[PDB]
């Protein structure tokens, strides 16, 4: 009966090809060249903030677009003040391997999560005074490598056993739990509705779950490598996938399937890290190649090079109102651009 | 400037916080630690599901051990995070290929390019008395040479060693009875070593 | 839980010396920066020193410098020296923490009665007593001689609320935004110079004393405190 089931998978998946090609009428390339060029697009390194002393691995942006948060293997989580490079806090962290971050859309709580499979959530307006950990949520097989919170009582966390989990604070214990990836998942985007989300997988696919049910509505393919990083597009219909094969792919959801890749012949490094602008016409990708290119998201043409960084970039983040975007290497520095 | 002179008062607090903390930190010398399971990991330093650190203190050196055999998942995405390690302790079982597959994949990786590769040699005693009634023929088909201790264990030194290629790494094999102390003060002088060959690569003379 | 106690009050005869102590448990105080509040008998709230984390800066009032002196176990200590007649009060211990979205002044202390034998922020209140009925809605005005509206946007108009025998507690910061533990029916408004805390749905347990107070520049200048007294 193994080979008939491998036959109807062969069939199913031979249906979904032909569906998806039979949609493809005209390339966003040929629709997009009616626009006029964005042009080139300069941007200055406004912050600098020091006071880092390892490699800064995440960066995640306070809903009020002036409190960033980042985490790196000093074993400290300090939590900046952007329109005036101070520190508010410095969250000691109980070990050392960090990889991911996160800031409350509120702003009380931060998490954090690493090689220590538990994902800490802390509470920043505690009355005693000081950031004490709220609940430390374990129960992962795996390093936690990106979470984000719904909101202030349920977080959403990717590891890298092939499942993606949504927790509960209050309670710590896993509400639902996603699987079906093959591989690592690396990374993870929560919608801006926050009634689903997507989690780019090490086996060069992204699939697109839902937060209620716990069932992987569709799964997208195309990338010849890992992915590393993912990001929604602003108006929620469609989403970015940084892959480790220096190119990074634009799905749309309804579409379901890739609209448009971004390559250049001079890139060879992979992408740690793709955001898209506040109206989605500019996707300032990170590149391990030292810089941080923009890509018009249409035009599929690049607009600028961040280079500023002295190492890998591990991380960028777009502000809410767009108003500054801020890439952390692994050189200790994170500089706020505009 | 109305109360931001305070928060600037906190901001400096911390930033020299970090900064005592920093230096205190840049003394440990950090070795991580690799093997095959049940190979004798945790019986080099005997004598002092997520990750493990160990952690001791020899001749005013705080040696953090991380063993990060605990992680089933794939090495090359969070082989990063251990970029910037002063050396790797490898622990190979002579009692029992997989290591050996092992170490050819980790001593080869683009972040480990500069970083040697210290290896331990446990279970010699075992090995012997192994030796004494099975021949190596068994684990390695190509061996052409004496049935002695002295030979085979000569003869996987080399295999070992010879499955590095970047000239920047020195391998410092060892063997251990699985009872002797003293592996502290191996590591310990293999690691001084290494800091010194570190030193004259950044002052442009090595 | 949070609790400020202190002691080391009783009668003190003229030109003498006191030491009154600030017993600080249950909370991190290594990080905040504690202030000193009196009051008199028959009068408002009067700023007297402050010391901030790690002791970094000590302020005094205009009428306190040199004669009292301030330090920091987690205890906090006010040295009193050369008292006069115008040092009978009741001093109050006050924390304050600060940065952004931070809440100063938002614990007071219990405080020990102690008795004796001009470019400042001058702030009036226009109304003294406003006697009104529960379920009815009341609002409590505050001026300024020089605007507090900040460059950075921020107006500094603390809002505190004095029950009768219990020290004040904190009720609006900033001038805009509401102290936690506090019920949302009250509410700032005013900018620049003119401020109004309004109360809407007034109940039984809101009545008492409030004090309009500023944070712009030291020394901080409370007000006149207005009266909210039942019918």
């Known amino acids: 009966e193994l080979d008939q089931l491998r036959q109807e998978a062969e069939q199913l998946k031979n249906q979904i090809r032909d569906a998806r090609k039979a949609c493809a009428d005209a390339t966003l390339s040929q629709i997009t060249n009616n626009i006029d060029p964005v042009g080139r697009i300069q941007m200055r390194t406004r912050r600098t903030l020091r006071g880092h002393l390892a490699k800064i691995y995440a960066m995640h942006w306070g809903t009020d677009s002036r409190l960033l948060v980042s985490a790196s293997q000093d074993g400290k989580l300090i939590i900046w003040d952007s329109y005036t490079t101070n520190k508010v806090h410095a969250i000691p962290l109980r070990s050392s391997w960090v990889m991911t971050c996160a800031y409350a859309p509120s702003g009380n709580y931060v998490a954090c999560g690493g090689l220590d499979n538990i994902c800490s959530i802390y509470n920043l307006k505690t009355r005693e005074g000081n950031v004490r950990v709220s609940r430390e949520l374990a129960g992962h097989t795996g390093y936690l490598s990106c979470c984000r919170f719904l909101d202030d009582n349920q977080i959403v966390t990717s590891s890298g056993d092939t499942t993606c989990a949504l927790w509960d604070i209050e309670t710590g214990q896993q509400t639902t739990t996603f699987t079906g990836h093959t591989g690592d998942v690396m990374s993870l985007s929560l919608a801006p509705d926050t009634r689903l989300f997507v989690s780019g997988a090490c086996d060069a696919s992204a699939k697109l779950w839902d937060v209620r049910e716990g069932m992987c509505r569709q799964t997208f393919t195309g990338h010849e490598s890992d992915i590393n990083a993912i990001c929604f597009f602003p108006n929620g219909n469609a989403f970015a996938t940084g892959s480790d094969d220096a190119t990074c792919r634009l799905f749309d959801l309804r579409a379901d399937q890739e609209l448009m890749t971004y390559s250049h012949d001079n890139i060879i490094c992979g992408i740690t890290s793709v955001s898209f602008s506040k109206s989605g016409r500019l996707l300032l990708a990170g590149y391990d190649d030292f810089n941080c290119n923009v890509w018009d998201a249409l035009k599929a043409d690049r607009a600028g090079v961040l280079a500023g960084h002295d190492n890998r970039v591990s991380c960028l983040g777009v502000t809410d109102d767009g108003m500054a975007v801020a890439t952390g290497s692994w050189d200790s520095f994170l500089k706020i651009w505009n | 400037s109305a109360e931001e002179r305070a928060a600037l008062e906190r901001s400096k607090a911390i930033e020299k916080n970090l900064k005592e903390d920093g230096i205190s930190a840049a003394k440990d010398v950090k070795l991580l630690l690799l093997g095959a399971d049940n190979s004798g990991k945790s019986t080099i330093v005997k004598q002092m599901t997520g990750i493990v650190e160990t952690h001791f203190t020899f001749k005013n050196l705080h040696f953090r051990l991380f063993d990060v055999g605990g992680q089933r998942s794939e090495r090359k995405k969070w082989i990063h995070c251990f970029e910037d390690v002063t050396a790797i302790i490898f622990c190979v079982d002579l009692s029992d290929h997989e290591s050996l597959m092992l170490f050819d994949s980790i001593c080869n990786n683009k972040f480990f390019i500069d970083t040697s590769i210290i290896l331990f040699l446990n279970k010699k005693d075992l090995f012997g008395e192994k030796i004494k009634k099975s021949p190596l023929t068994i684990c390695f088909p190509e061996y052409t040479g004496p049935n002695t201790y002295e030979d085979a264990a000569a003869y996987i030194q080399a295999q070992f060693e010879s499955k590095n290629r970047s000239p920047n790494k020195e391998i410092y094999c060892h063997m251990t009875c699985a009872t002797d102390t003293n592996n502290a003060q191996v590591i310990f002088d293999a690691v001084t070593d290494i800091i010194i060959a570190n030193n004259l690569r950044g002052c442009g003379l090595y | 839980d949070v609790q400020l106690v202190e002691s080391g009050g009783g009668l003190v005869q003229p030109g003498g010396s006191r030491k009154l102590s600030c017993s600080a448990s249950?909370?991190?105080?290594?990080?905040?920066?504690m202030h000193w509040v009196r009051q008199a008998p028959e009068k408002g709230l009067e700023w007297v020193a402050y010391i901030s984390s790690g002791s970094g800066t000590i302020y005094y009032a205009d009428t306190v410098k040199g004669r009292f002196t301030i330090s920091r176990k987690n205890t906090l200590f006010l040295q009193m020296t050369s008292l006069r007649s115008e040092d009978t009060a009741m001093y109050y211990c006050v924390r304050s923490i600060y940065y952004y979205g931070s809440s100063p002044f938002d614990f007071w202390g219990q405080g020990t009665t102690l008795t004796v034998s001009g470019s400042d922020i001058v702030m009036t209140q226009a109304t003294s007593s406003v006697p009104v009925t529960p379920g009815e809605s009341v609002s409590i005005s505050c001026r300024s001689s020089?605007?507090?509206?900040?460059?950075?946007?921020?107006?500094?108009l603390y809002w505190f609320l004095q029950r009768p025998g219990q020290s004040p507690q904190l009720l609006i910061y900033?001038?805009?935004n509401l102290a936690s533990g506090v019920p949302d029916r009250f509410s700032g408004s005013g900018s620049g110079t003119a401020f109004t805390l309004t109360i809407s749905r007034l109940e039984a347990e809101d009545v008492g004393v409030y004090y309009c107070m500023q944070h712009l520049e030291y020394p901080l200048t409370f007000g006149a405190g207005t009266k909210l007294e039942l019918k």
């Open positions: 900033r001038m805009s």
């Open positions: 020089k605007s507090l509206l900040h460059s950075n946007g921020n107006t500094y």
């Open positions: 249950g909370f991190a105080f290594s990080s905040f920066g």
